[PDB]
Design a protein around this ligand. Structure first.
Ligand SMILES: NC(=[NH2+])NCCC[C@H](N)C(=O)O
Length: 238
């Protein structure tokens, strides 16, 4: 038996996947997916906002039951928690000022100030490959502070999910004078294989129900109808 109310944690600072509208209500693709799956699962769902780096600890502590927050499915995370089937693809890419020669390389980022989300796969990658080697990698409680430090010049570059940067910043007025700096960063190990619903390992029935709802809403075309609100491309991937 699934719980009468499935509590879903999300970090609402990652448009267009999860953010807040003017009323403070949860909006974005993650929210739409979550709500549609819950509908099909015939359970009530209650969204819970928290910082991104608090989601997996909250899940483990049973303060929430699920995470839908562009949570990348990684080898390392799977040693701690479970995942539903893939919700959508997620690649990492740097952003910087328009015209920046910055590339996702150690040589290019020497003496540069680079922002990453605390508890993200991007922080993991940046800390290991760049911060130890002298690059000023700065971790942030949330992505909106990163964008703001970038636009104010405190940061030279930021590393986050490509689609989030693109739709949530670059294509917005705030990011008109900014661009991707270099191609997406390739690293299977660190960045994983798309995003999924984060779940406790022993909640097998809940995972199965999420997986069932997801397959069904993909199959009947509801996934693509919801995605078109945000994207003119195949957000799902392969
Ligand atoms: N709602 C968010 N802030 N999501 C951040 C996700 C970034 C990256 N995909 C990760 O799992 O670490």
């Amino acid at each position: 038996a699934l719980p009468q109310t499935v509590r879903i944690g999300t970090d609402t600072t990652y448009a267009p996947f999860s953010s807040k509208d003017a009323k403070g209500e949860f909006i974005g693709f993650d929210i739409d997916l979550g709500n549609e799956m819950c509908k099909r699962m015939q359970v009530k769902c209650t969204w819970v906002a928290s910082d991104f780096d608090a989601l997996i600890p909250s899940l483990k502590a049973k303060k929430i039951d699920a995470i839908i927050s562009s949570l990348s499915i990684t080898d390392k995370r799977q040693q701690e928690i479970a995942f539903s089937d893939k919700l959508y693809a997620a690649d990492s890419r740097l952003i910087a000022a328009k015209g920046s020669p910055i590339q996702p390389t150690l040589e290019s980022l020497k003496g540069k100030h680079v922002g990453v989300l605390q508890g993200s796969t991007q922080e993991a990658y940046a800390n290991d490959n760049w911060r130890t080697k002298g690059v000023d990698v700065v971790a942030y409680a949330n992505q909106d502070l990163i964008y703001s430090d970038l636009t104010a010049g405190r940061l030279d570059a930021a590393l986050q999910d490509e689609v989030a940067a693109s739709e949530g910043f670059l294509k917005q007025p705030a990011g008109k004078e900014y661009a991707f700096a270099g191609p997406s960063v390739k690293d299977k190990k660190y960045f994983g294989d798309g995003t999924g619903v984060g779940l406790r390992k022993d909640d097998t029935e809940l995972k199965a129900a999420f997986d069932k709802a997801l397959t069904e809403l993909r199959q009947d075309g509801t996934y693509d109808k919801m995605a078109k609100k945000y994207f003119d491309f195949n957000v799902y991937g392969d």
